[PDB]
């Protein structure tokens, strides 16, 4: 009965907000989900619409609507899973740093075409879902984001090598910076793990 849930939620949105961009984009999500035959996409649209209902005229609601649009437009199911986990994190704790981390991580994961980035993002999102409202969860989401950025920097390096010594050196520095940041975050996570085990 998921489609009926989505329809009733859209009706509630229509009742609550008149001639608002959130309402028009919610109707757009409604039609894009009705056209879509994927159950995961239906669940993601449901979650985004419910988040918009809970926080009307909010930055999180607008960004989540646009993220749900970008996720429905993508035909990759792994990206849909990542977006669903991130939107669930946002639904549980909206006014938290984890919400922003998960929103931006899903926004970047929709763009990424690498399967390893999607896998590590799903792992980090499930780790944050396991023990939410903790320092370790924030560190995990930030680590996943830094890994995605490392992949993006490698893509840039390749594309610039195909086609400038100063630009190559600049991109090498920008890669090593985020590499060091990734390993530092990993060491911090390992320290928190050491303290949790003892």
């Amino acid at each position: 009965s998921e489609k009926e849930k989505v329809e009733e939620l859209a009706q509630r949105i229509r009742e609550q907000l008149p001639d608002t961009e959130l309402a028009r984009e919610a109707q757009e999500l409604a039609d894009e989900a009705r056209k879509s035959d994927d159950s995961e996409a239906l669940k993601v649209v449901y979650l985004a619409l419910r988040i918009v209902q809970q926080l009307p005229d909010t930055e999180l609601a607008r960004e989540a609507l646009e993220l749900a649009k970008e996720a429905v437009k993508s035909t990759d199911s792994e990206a849909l899973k990542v977006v669903y986990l991130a939107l669930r994190i946002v639904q549980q704790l909206p006014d938290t740093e984890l919400a922003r981390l998960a929103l931006e991580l899903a926004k970047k994961a929709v763009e990424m075409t690498a399967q390893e980035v999607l896998e590590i993002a799903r792992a980090a999102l499930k780790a944050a879902q396991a023990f939410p409202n903790t320092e370790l969860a924030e560190l995990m989401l930030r680590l996943a984001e830094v890994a995605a950025r490392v992949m993006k920097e490698l893509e840039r390096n390749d594309e610039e090598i195909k086609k400038d010594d100063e630009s190559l050196l600049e991109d090498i520095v920008e890669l090593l910076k985020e590499i060091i940041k990734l390993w530092k975050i990993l060491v911090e996570v390992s320290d928190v793990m050491l303290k949790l085990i003892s």
């Binding site: 390893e116 992949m151 390096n157």
Partner: protein
């Protein structure tokens, strides 16, 4: 169980990392030999392409290991 699956995946990724280390050794030797045989502009570009391939494979192995690390942290909490 989940830990058994993670351990199987870890053994497979360790074998893959050993293969990547072999690639690193062979690439270092090849770069040294090509430097001794004659450096060139287009030769430098070819060496760049090979090096980027090796770096890409190594980084993918690293990211798979880090994803398994994240799953393990989620399990232990």
């Amino acid at each position: 169980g989940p830990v058994d699956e993670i351990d199987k995946e870890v053994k497979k990724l360790e074998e893959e990392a050993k293969k990547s280390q072999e690639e690193v050794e062979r690439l270092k030797q090849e770069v040294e030999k090509a430097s001794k045989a004659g450096l060139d502009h287009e030769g430098d570009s070819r060496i760049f392409k090979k090096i980027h391939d090796v770096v890409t494979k190594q980084i993918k192995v690293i990211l798979r290991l880090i994803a398994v690390y994240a799953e393990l942290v989620a399990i232990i909490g």
